[PDB]
């Protein structure tokens, strides 16, 4: 339990979410943010895969 269960990049997704180092993202957001760089644009660390 690290904060609320939302996609920090969407503010809309609450189901089927992946866990970052300190928050959550969505599957669509994970596939869309892995296209620019491996570093998380929120917590600045590599995204798990």
């Amino acid at each position: 339990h690290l904060g609320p269960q939302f996609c920090k990049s969407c503010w809309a997704e609450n189901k089927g979410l992946v866990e970052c180092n300190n928050h959550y993202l969505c599957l669509n957001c994970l596939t869309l943010l892995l296209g620019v760089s491996s570093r998380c644009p929120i917590c600045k660390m590599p995204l798990p895969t």
């Binding site: 939302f6 990049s9 969407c10 869309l32 943010l33 644009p41 600045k44």
Partner: protein, 1402 residues
């Protein structure tokens, strides 16, 4: 009985000064035996002593014969009509100049200021009367707060006062004379006087009637269970009537698609449909004349030197032939232009049959030649000069006079590079053969379609700064047009060379008013014409790089979106188009539209918004350019907030919030003051006419009918039929229900919520002198102007009593944060905690908090509270009663405009409400001069009581919601806007039952409407973003709001001393770095400020601004530290040795041999010697002779700049922006620097005297830091110009030592230099020795211990004596200014990437 009389006669005989008129009054005083006459003659003696002291201190002749102004005018032979009869204290005649003196003594500050302002008013009336007869008068007023004088000693005068008081112990004087009123006035004039209840309380039955109005129907003594039962039943009834439909819902669930479709359909009748970015760039680059000028693809100097020289000597009036002098100047400039054009140079200051002469005015060649021929012909008619010797002689005469006028002030005319060979023997002939035959310059008011444009409309890509450069040049041209003198073609002209050409901004009207400018070019004639307001084009004057950089930052926030990369260039183009549109067309409507965009995007990322949000966002647009801005905003939101983005919503929300806060780039001033004043009066009056209490001409002695109307409206204000009525609640209607007011007061009572001028008598309306007469003014804001109710000093004191009472009440509680910074910080922390957990946050604003509130509402909520521990509260009640019966002076401009419109309508159209009001009043004879009404809480005059009411009401409403639902609601208010933080239960309720949650929010809205807490349509119920006090929080972080701070920095340029301006800009940039702004943009802001100062030809000093900072000097560095870093960058060798010696000194001082006791004395000797003395005392190698002669030109060395003795003893004594810059450039160009002989001179004279020396070098580092290295051989040798120079190493040592005392010892260490979406909320780690309790701390003790004389004049162990010693003698900075004038910044949210590129030091 006579013993005290005889003894005091002895004392006044022995201690009295020897005078001849005082001896006459004495012999007239000692002869009387009646004690009352002794009192009168003693006060007469004191008054005459005061009068003659004032007269000998002011050098005026004493008026003892009680001669009025008519007597003084008749004794000199000046016959005047019947004017005001005023007898002054003294008069002084110097030809046509009269100096008038009036003296008075007052014990109370309110009476003192009352007498001061009435004396000021009568003096101005006498001035206006004396100008009608053409006599110049100057006013002088002597208001003395004490009874001291310079003839009788202090203690004997006190004994005289005490014996006069002891003779008032008897009663024979009391029943013989001195009636109760006069006796009380005299006893108060002899006395030395927070409530002052010693007033003649004659409150009639009206007070008791109004008090009973606050009690009938209201219970205020209910049970903690009965109130909960009533609230539950009321919620049941409300929810029933809501589910049925009898009560309209106000909150709609946020559908982003529907919200965007509602925003795009705004102005559907005037905007066609969606527009692509390409069509927008096409229509934008050729939209308006100012925008057509930009993106146009448009491709020594003896005349300029002569023009500048003659512009310098045109103000000194070298000849009383204004027109003929201007003609001589035009002829000289023509000769200079011809001499320039024959050699090699082209036409530079020409436009075609029109040239730019002195006083930046266009003069036609034909008219110049005709007038010169007429002048020379008329001079030749009298008698030989062959039509050329006379002109040569007169030119030699005027040039000699001008050179002599520039020689005594030290201008050194050879500084202008005049090259005085243009005065040829064939000057007249050379002028008459001058034929340019160019294009005729015109203005062409009301121009035509863009197809009549000379150049190619639109070629500049919106990626280079050329458009911003042209905008900067044009804005500077307008601001310089603001300063034309216009003495006596007639059109004036400024010049702005952009590239390979020199455009000329022509304008016929003068002043800072809105006029019609015409951009002309010599090659194509008139280029553009536009009706512009010059005082609004400031924020782009030199920010060609600042604006490009803020655009680049805003774009880089969303650049790594991976779904805008196909539209990133279009988004950047749209952002720059919006910026250049709001900067090239600063209009209040564009500002309002961007604020409405802020509200829209705040309501876009939420769960529920107000149904009337789009009605508030849509504001009327005119001029077809504001529609272009709306289309740009719509396209930008369509690109950024498209349906298929769903990625990093935080970054896009921040970007659009900054696009909205771009409104601050438009100046917050009024376009026209009359229309905005009428609008403020409309905002003030419309609720009153809609409520039904608009009583005009209050008739200070209140009539029975006026009081009856007042109490009737007081009873009407308490009706507010709730949801239990037939029709239902009428939202947005002023008034508070008796039921909910009783519930609030009952729940507060039990432990459920918190758990000849002095006033002699006073009644229910006012203190027998005025029923709190206020004046209505408008306060400049970005979106819409605010109200201001300004009152006299007595009303100020009464409001201060009320506000102190209610501020104590609020401090006893722990919910409100308006003047409590600790509670604001707790609110920010709780908001971060509630947002980071995605709990529902209700950002509420309250529409019409001022006009709809009521002093009667506060009185009623006060009379029903118990306040278990009656005087004190009765005084508060009668003060609020006075506030109910309050007059507000309608502005004379508003009533004048309304009277003019009434005349125009009666002589010569859907009139408004206030217009109909004024007309109905004018048709019956009465003129509206004051509007006494009940429904007006002053905007600011009742801020503390309004905050307390908001606090208790929001506490009650949250208690009701929690008792009817089962969820706590934290609340934090600022008396206008608030935030409600919901717990986990309400958030889970919204997640599981949206209908019940929206019903709860509708109940909250209805309950707030049952008080005077109408929830504004700008309110937002969102579990992600939260707004409070213009602080936006996204996910526990904070929105940078970069554009707000950037615009606040580009705007705040005052006309004060340049170093104070630099301090202000440094504080603004410190706040900017603190919140969100990166370091490069702030370096560019500081460079922009330095360029603003350089344009004023100011000698930029190293102690102005550091424009090479690396986010290490803002987080944990004072302004002194930044200036020290700048000096270190200047001299990287000597500053190293100085830092070494200062490190050793700090080491030996903090925990070593006692050095502070004699360092205070060591800092008072000569700096050059003391440097080497200290370096040898510490053993470190002293600075070399070459690395010690570095100095900076301190213009304010002998006396500060006279922007029309240490400085720290002066900072504790506590127009427009473009006009401020104009005044700064004018003062820094005129005689601003003062000399040692108390003589003023220009800065040019100081540069000339510097060049009149073989020692100084003038070496600048990179941007004009301008530090000199005057050698030690001529250092203060024979009182040369070197007195203005101040050694740089000494000041650097002072600043470094003071900074080491302020923030740690790490500063002395040698500086070892070592995605735009990451931030680090760090703190200014510093073991300070200047604890924040230093408002009037021991600094004053040190000042009095070291500078006693300075402690007496202009005024009134701890490791602090050095802080006060390092600025009284080391006059470089204040070094203590962020504790008593400015305020420190903590919790720095700076970029983490820019922390790793910083410098470090041990």
């Amino acid at each position: 009985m006579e013993e005290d009389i005889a003894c005091v006669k002895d004392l006044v005989s022995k201690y009295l000064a020897n005078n001849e008129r005082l001896s006459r009054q004495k012999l007239a005083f000692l002869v009387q035996t009646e004690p009352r006459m002794l009192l009168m003659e003693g006060l007469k003696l004191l008054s005459l002593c005061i009068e003659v002291d004032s007269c000998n201190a002011n050098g005026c002749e004493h008026n003892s014969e009680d001669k009025s102004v008519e007597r003084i005018l008749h004794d000199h032979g000046v016959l005047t009509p019947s004017l005001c009869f005023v007898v002054p204290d003294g008069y002084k005649l110097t030809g046509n100049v009269l100096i008038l003196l009036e003296c008075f003594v007052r014990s109370s500050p309110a009476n003192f200021e009352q007498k001061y302002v009435e004396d000021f008013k009568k003096l101005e009336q006498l001035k206006e009367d004396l100008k009608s007869v053409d006599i110049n008068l100057i006013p002088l007023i002597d208001g003395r707060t004490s009874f001291y004088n310079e003839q009788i000693p202090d203690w004997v005068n006190d004994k005289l006062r005490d014996t006069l008081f002891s003779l008032l112990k008897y009663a024979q004087e009391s029943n013989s004379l001195f009636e109760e009123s006069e006796y009380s006035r005299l006893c108060e004039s002899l006395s030395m006087t927070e409530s002052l209840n010693a007033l003649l309380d004659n409150r009639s039955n009206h007070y008791e009637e109004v008090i009973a109005s606050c009690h009938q129907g209201i219970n205020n003594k209910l049970t903690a269970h009965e109130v909960k039962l009533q609230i539950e039943e009321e919620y049941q009834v409300f929810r029933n009537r809501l589910r049925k439909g009898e009560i309209e819902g106000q909150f709609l669930k946020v559908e982003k698609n529907q919200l965007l479709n509602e925003f795009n359909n705004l102005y559907a009748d005037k905007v066609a449909e969606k527009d692509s970015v390409e069509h927008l760039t096409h229509q934008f680059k050729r939209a308006s004349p100012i925008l057509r000028f930009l993106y146009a693809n448009i491709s020594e100097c003896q005349m300029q030197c002569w023009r500048s020289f003659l512009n310098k000597v045109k103000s000194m009036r070298i000849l009383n032939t204004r027109r003929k002098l201007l003609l001589i100047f035009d002829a000289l400039i023509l000769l200079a232009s011809k001499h320039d054009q024959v050699r090699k140079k082209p036409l530079r200051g020409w436009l075609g049959t029109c040239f730019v002469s002195v006083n930046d005015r266009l003069v036609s060649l034909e008219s110049t030649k005709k007038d010169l021929k007429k002048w020379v012909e008329r001079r030749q008619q009298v008698e030989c000069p062959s039509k050329n010797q006379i002109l040569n002689s007169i030119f030699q005469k005027t040039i000699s006079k001008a050179t002599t006028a520039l020689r005594d002030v030290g201008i050194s005319v050879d500084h202008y590079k005049i090259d005085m060979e243009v005065i040829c023997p064939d000057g007249y002939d050379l002028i008459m053969d001058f034929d340019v035959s160019g294009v005729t310059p015109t203005i062409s008011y009301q121009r035509s379609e863009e197809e009549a444009f000379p150049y190619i409309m639109g070629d500049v890509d919106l990626l280079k700064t050329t458009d911003l450069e042209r905008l900067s040049s044009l804005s500077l041209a307008l601001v310089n047009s603001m300063k034309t003198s216009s003495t006596v073609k007639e059109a004036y002209c400024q010049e702005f060379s952009l590239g390979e050409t020199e455009f000329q901004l022509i304008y016929q009207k003068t002043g800072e008013c809105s006029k019609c400018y015409a951009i002309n070019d010599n090659r194509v004639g008139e280029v553009c014409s536009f009706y512009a307001d010059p005082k609004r084009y400031f924020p782009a004057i030199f920010s060609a790089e600042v604006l490009q950089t803020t655009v680049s930052t805003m774009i880089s926030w969303i650049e790594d979106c991976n779904e805008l990369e196909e539209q990133l260039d279009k988004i950047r183009s749209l952002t720059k188009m919006i910026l250049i549109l709001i900067l090239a067309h600063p209009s209040k409507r564009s500002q309002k539209l961007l604020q409405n965009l802020r509200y829209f995007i705040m309501a876009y990322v939420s769960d529920y918004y107000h149904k009337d949000l789009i009605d508030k966002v849509r504001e009327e647009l005119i001029t077809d350019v504001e529609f272009l801005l709306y289309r740009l905003l719509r396209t930008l939101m369509g690109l950024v907030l498209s349906e298929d983005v769903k990625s990093m919503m935080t970054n896009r929300f921040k970007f659009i919030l900054n696009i909205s806060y771009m409104c601050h780039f438009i100046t917050k001033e009024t376009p026209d003051r009359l229309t905005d004043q009428i609008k403020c009066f409309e905002k003030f009056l419309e609720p009153k006419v809609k409520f039904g209490h608009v009583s005009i001409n209050p008739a200070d002695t209140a009539t029975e009918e006026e009081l009856d109307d007042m109490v009737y409206n007081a009873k009407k204000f308490l009706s507010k039929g709730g949801c239990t009525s037939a029709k239902g609640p009428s939202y947005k209607k002023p008034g508070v229900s008796k039921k909910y007011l009783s519930l609030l007061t009952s729940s507060f009572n039990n432990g459920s919520l918190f758990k000849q001028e002095s006033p002699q008598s006073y009644n229910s309306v006012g203190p027998d002198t005025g029923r709190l007469k206020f004046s209505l003014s408008y306060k400049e804001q970005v979106g819409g102007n605010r109200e201001l109710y300004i009152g006299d000093l007595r009303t100020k004191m009464f409001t201060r009593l009320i506000e102190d009472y209610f501020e104590a009440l609020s401090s006893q509680l722990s919910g409100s944060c308006l003047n409590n910074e600790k509670e604001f910080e707790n609110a920010i922390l709780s908001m971060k905690l509630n947002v980071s957990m995605a709990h529902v946050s209700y950002s509420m604003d309250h529409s019409k908090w001022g006009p709809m509130m009521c002093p009667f509402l506060f009185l009623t909520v006060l009379q029903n509270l118990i306040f278990l521990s009656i005087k004190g509260r009765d005084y508060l009640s009668t003060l609020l009663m006075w506030h109910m019966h309050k007059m507000v002076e309608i502005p004379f401009n508003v009533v004048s405009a309304m009277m003019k419109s009434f005349i125009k309508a009666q002589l010569g159209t859907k009139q408004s409400i206030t217009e109909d009001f004024f007309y109905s009043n004018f048709q019956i004879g009465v003129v509206p001069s004051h509007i006494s009404s009940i429904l007006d809480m002053g905007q600011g005059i009742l801020h503390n009581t309004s905050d307390f009411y908001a606090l208790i009401t929001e506490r009650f409403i949250n208690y009701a919601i929690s008792c009817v639902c089962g969820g706590t609601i934290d609340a934090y208010t600022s008396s206008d806007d608030q935030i409600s933080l919901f717990d986990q239960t309400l958030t889970e309720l919204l997640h599981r039952d949206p209908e019940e949650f929206r019903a709860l929010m509708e109940f909250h809205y209805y309950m707030s409407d049952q008080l005077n807490k109408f929830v504004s349509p700008k309110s937002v119920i969102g579990r992600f973003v939260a707004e409070f006090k213009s602080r936006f929080f996204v996910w526990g972080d904070e929105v940078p709001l970069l554009t707000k701070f950037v615009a606040a920095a580009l705007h705040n340029i005052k006309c004060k001393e340049p170093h104070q301006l630099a301090e202000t800009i440094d504080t603004i940039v410190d706040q900017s770095v603190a919140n969100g702004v990166p370091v490069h943009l702030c370096n560019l802001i500081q460079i922009r400020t330095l360029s603003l100062l350089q344009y004023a030809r100011y000698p930029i000093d190293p102690f102005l601004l550091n424009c090479e900072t690396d986010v290490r000097d803002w987080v944990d560095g004072n302004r002194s530290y930044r200036i020290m870093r700048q000096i270190e960058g200047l001299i990287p060798d000597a500053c190293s040795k100085i830092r070494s010696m200062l490190r050793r000194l700090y080491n030996r001082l903090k925990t070593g041999q006692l050095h502070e006791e004699f360092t205070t004395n060591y800092l008072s000797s000569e700096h050059l010697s003391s440097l080497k003395n200290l370096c040898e005392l510490l053993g470190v190698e002293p600075p070399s002779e070459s690395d010690l002669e570095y100095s900076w030109l301190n213009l304010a060395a002998h006396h500060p700049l006279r922007m029309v003795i240490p400085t720290i003893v002066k900072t504790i004594q506590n127009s427009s922006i473009a006009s401020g810059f104009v005044g700064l450039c004018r003062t820094l160009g005129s005689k601003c620097v003062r000399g040692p002989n108390k003589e003023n001179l220009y800065i040019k004279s100081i540069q000339s005297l510097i060049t009149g020396t073989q020692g100084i070098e003038l070496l600048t580092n990179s941007i004009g830091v301008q530090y000199w290295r005057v050698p030690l051989g001529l250092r203060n040798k024979s009182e040369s110009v070197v007195s203005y120079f101040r050694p740089l190493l000494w000041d650097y040592m002072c600043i470094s030592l003071s900074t080491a005392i302020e923030l740690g010892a790490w500063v002395l260490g040698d500086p070892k230099t070592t995605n735009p979406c990451d931030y680090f909320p760090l703190k200014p780690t510093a073991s300070k020795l200047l604890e924040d309790r230093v408002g009037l701390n021991h600094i004053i003790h040190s000042l009095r211990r070291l500078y006693p004389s300075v402690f007496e004049k202009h005024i009134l162990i701890k490791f602090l004596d050095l802080c006060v010693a390092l600025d009284v003698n080391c006059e470089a900075l204040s070094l203590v200014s962020h504790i008593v004038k400015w305020k420190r910044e903590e919790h720095y949210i700076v970029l983490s990437s820019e922390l790793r590129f910083s410098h470090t030091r041990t």
